[PDB]
């Protein structure tokens, strides 16, 4: 065509079938009855979103007052792929033997980890993958690590029980499991745990790790945690981060240092 363009990494926009067409798909419900007014409202909402020249390919009523739409449209906005600052979750993992050697050489003593699915949450499959020595897809857990004493407290653990057990066992790092952001109780529970640790005064003496199927590093750092892990994490990543951070910031730990 006369005015078609080539790729530009500073102005990347979606790709339906041509380099810079920017075609997008989206679906949503509206609390209005079906009709031509509903279609016009959806089109106006799509135009306000950014999709210039939208086209409603589907619309059907779910109820007497609800309609479900599907829209395809050409976008206007562009993102700059070269200046993106990414997130702070980039990490690479050393092997188990390397972790043991690092702990022996630098710290000189075993690292204690206490993990639990605090709050009312019941799931333990991810935390058992990370902790349990059986491993997950060939990645052995923290319990297997020779120089790591890992405790698995299960689920439905109250925060008070968690902090009390951490103090009793002399924990150097604490792990907390949660679930997707559509669970909104995870934020409140994590904030409550942080407040409890601050009140106890043990916050500075231990690390904090929070993860889950859709936890992210940005949210973890916003809450006050020291890290955040999502899907695809394996025990070697966690062990590497714990050892490296412990040596970098010289966490004293609670081992033989009860409050």
């Amino acid at each position: 065509k006369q005015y078609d363009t080539t790729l530009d990494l500073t102005r990347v926009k979606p790709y339906g079938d041509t380099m810079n067409d920017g075609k997008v798909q989206l679906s949503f419900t509206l609390p209005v009855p079906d009709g031509a007014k509903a279609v016009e409202a959806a089109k106006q909402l799509a135009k306000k979103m950014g999709l210039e020249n939208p086209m409603v390919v589907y619309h059907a009523p779910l109820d007497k007052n609800f309609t479900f739409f599907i829209i395809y449209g050409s976008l206007i906005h562009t993102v700059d792929y070269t200046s993106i600052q990414v997130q702070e979750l980039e990490i690479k993992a050393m092997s188990m033997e390397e972790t043991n050697e690092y702990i022996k050489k630098h710290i000189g003593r075993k690292v204690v980890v206490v993990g639990a699915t605090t709050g009312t949450d019941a799931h333990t499959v991810g935390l058992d993958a990370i902790m349990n020595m059986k491993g997950y897809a060939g990645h052995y857990g923290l319990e297997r690590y020779e120089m790591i004493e890992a405790y698995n407290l299960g689920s439905q653990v109250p925060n008070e029980e968690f902090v009390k057990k951490a103090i009793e066992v002399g924990a150097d790092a604490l792990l907390v499991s949660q679930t997707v952001t559509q669970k909104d109780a995870h934020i409140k529970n994590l904030t409550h745990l942080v407040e409890l640790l601050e009140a106890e005064g043990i916050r500075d003496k231990v690390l904090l790790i929070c993860g889950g199927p859709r936890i992210t590093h940005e949210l973890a750092k916003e809450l006050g945690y020291d890290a955040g892990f999502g899907p695809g994490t394996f025990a070697d990543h966690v062990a590497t981060f714990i050892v490296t951070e412990m040596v970098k910031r010289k966490i004293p730990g609670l081992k033989g240092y009860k409050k």
Partner: protein, 520 residues
């Protein structure tokens, strides 16, 4: 001889059934000689006690706590309630109110002859039994009037946490092709030792199971059934430390289905096994009398263990649950034994294995309204491949005639369903069930093929596991972590302090009424 497509070994099935029967005999030896506090609170609720005191604790809780701390709870709450009825001459609810306010002390009244106490309580027991029976009659009348489906019953869950938005979206889904509506319970209600009071507009992960919520949702679904001309069922969960209480509340509010399994509680909520077994007996007696279909939860085993390696565990658990239900008096027509379409989607011939297992389950339990539930473990963020996996789930449901169909959702791995996700799931299921309406009666299987061999392999493994569990006993087998690969100590978990030993003069009017009224 029984007809089969898998050329099942029926002698092996008979031996597995006998092993499960003997397991249940051994476990019931203990259950007969014990009772829990939840059973006593349920007796109080059935006798007419309800409401809350100033502090917000229900009155059954107050009465049972008073009897336990001040007196001998091994005699049962019925003994003391009836004695107070003879003494003061009031009704059980008035006695509970007086105890709550502190104007009466049940354990200080002189104890009358037990025969007179039984006579005093019998009338109220019969009245409550008759109310439950009339509810059953009304449900049967509704089903007869509107007619009943012949294919699968679509089963959707509404979980917004607000009772009124739950009503709105339940009516919306019922107006769509949904046949059974389940209101998933609020997270951390199984841990409570009391049943809340009144309607709730708040809840994390679900809605609280209260009697007023039951009444509200029953009214809404009755109105929608009148509108649509077909019967919409109501489902709830009778798990937790208050299992028999919720069973009684559902029986009184005319729920049509109820999720009643103790192994789920023990393995996934960490409740004591003795507590849960003793609760489960009474709750299943109530559900059997009330006409409710009890649903078990062997689907949950596969989310922790491996589905191909530990498939026989589901069958063994199903046989044990069948025998428990039979001892409680539940007929096969009310035994919704559950299994799930839960293998790895990257497994070659995985569809043949799931089909073989579903057909074997459909053949061992021919009368049961078997429940089939969607894939959950291997669901990812691809909503489109998820729709495809759900389509294969529906295909297996229609090819092997499963009675109840728990609709899988486009976005299981992401969040609880939207309105649109439920609409899409219902639409896909209706499409597939209409196109293959009569595929079950057409397709047969090669003699000696993958399907027959898989079925016989799973059956043999289940029989061996049942013999092992029979040798040790159910409690020991649970201790060694054979179901769901979860090891649970016998004396651990929550609620062991609620278990008590029956006195030689223990009195519970309702067991005999509910076990002989249904039989004669």
């Amino acid at each position: 001889m029984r007809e089969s497509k898998l050329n099942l070994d029926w002698e092996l099935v008979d031996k597995a059934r006998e092993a499960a029967r003997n397991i249940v005999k051994d476990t019931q030896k203990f259950i007969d000689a014990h009772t829990t506090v939840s059973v006593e609170r349920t007796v109080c609720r059935l006798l007419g006690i309800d409401g809350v005191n100033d502090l917000g604790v229900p009155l059954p809780n107050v009465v049972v706590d008073h009897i336990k701390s001040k007196g001998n709870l091994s005699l049962g709450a019925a003994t003391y309630i009836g004695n107070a009825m003879i003494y003061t001459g009031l009704s059980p609810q008035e006695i509970a109110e007086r105890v709550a306010k502190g104007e009466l002390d049940l354990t200080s009244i002189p104890m009358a002859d037990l025969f007179e106490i039984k006579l005093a309580v019998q009338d109220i027991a019969i009245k409550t039994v008759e109310k439950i029976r009339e509810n059953r009659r009304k449900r049967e009348e509704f089903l007869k009037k509107y007619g009943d489906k012949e294919g699968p019953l679509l089963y959707v869950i509404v979980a917004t946490g607000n009772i009124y938005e739950d009503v709105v979206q339940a009516q919306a889904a019922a107006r769509q092709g949904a046949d059974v509506i389940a209101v998933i319970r609020a997270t951390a209600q199984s841990l409570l030792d009391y049943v809340p009071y009144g309607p709730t507009t708040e809840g994390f992960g679900g809605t609280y199971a209260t009697q007023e919520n039951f009444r509200i949702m029953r009214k809404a679904l009755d109105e929608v059934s009148e509108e649509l001309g077909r019967y919409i069922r109501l489902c709830n969960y009778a798990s937790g430390l208050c299992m028999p209480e919720i069973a009684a509340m559902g029986a009184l509010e005319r729920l049509d289905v109820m999720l009643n399994d103790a192994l789920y509680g023990i393995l996934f909520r960490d409740i004591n096994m003795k507590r849960t077994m003793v609760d489960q007996f009474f709750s299943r007696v109530i559900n059997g009398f009330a006409g409710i279909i009890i649903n078990t939860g062997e689907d949950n085993y596969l989310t922790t263990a491996d589905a191909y390696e530990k498939a026989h565990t589901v069958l063994a658990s199903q046989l044990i649950n069948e025998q428990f239900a039979l001892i409680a008096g539940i007929p096969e027509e009310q035994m919704g034994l559950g299994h799930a379409f839960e293998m790895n989607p990257d497994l070659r011939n995985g569809f043949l294995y799931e089909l073989a297992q579903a057909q074997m389950v459909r053949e061992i339990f021919p009368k049961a309204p078997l429940k089939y539930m969607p894939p959950t473990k291997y669901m990812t963020g691809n909503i489109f491949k998820g729709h495809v996996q759900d389509a294969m789930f529906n295909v297996v449901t229609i090819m092997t005639k499963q009675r109840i169909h728990l609709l899988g959702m486009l976005t299981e791995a992401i969040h609880t369903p939207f309105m649109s996700d439920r609409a899409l799931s219902i639409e896909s299921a209706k499409y597939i069930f209409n196109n293959m309406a009569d595929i079950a009666d057409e397709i047969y299987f090669k003699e000696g093929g993958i399907i027959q061999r898989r079925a016989n392999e799973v059956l043999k493994k289940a029989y061996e596991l049942l013999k092992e569990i029979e040798q040790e006993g159910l409690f020991k087998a649970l201790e060694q972590g054979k179901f769901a690969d979860i090891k649970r100590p016998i004396d651990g978990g929550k609620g062991l302090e609620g278990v008590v030993e029956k006195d030689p003069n223990y009195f519970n009017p309702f067991i005999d009424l509910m076990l002989r009224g249904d039989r004669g």
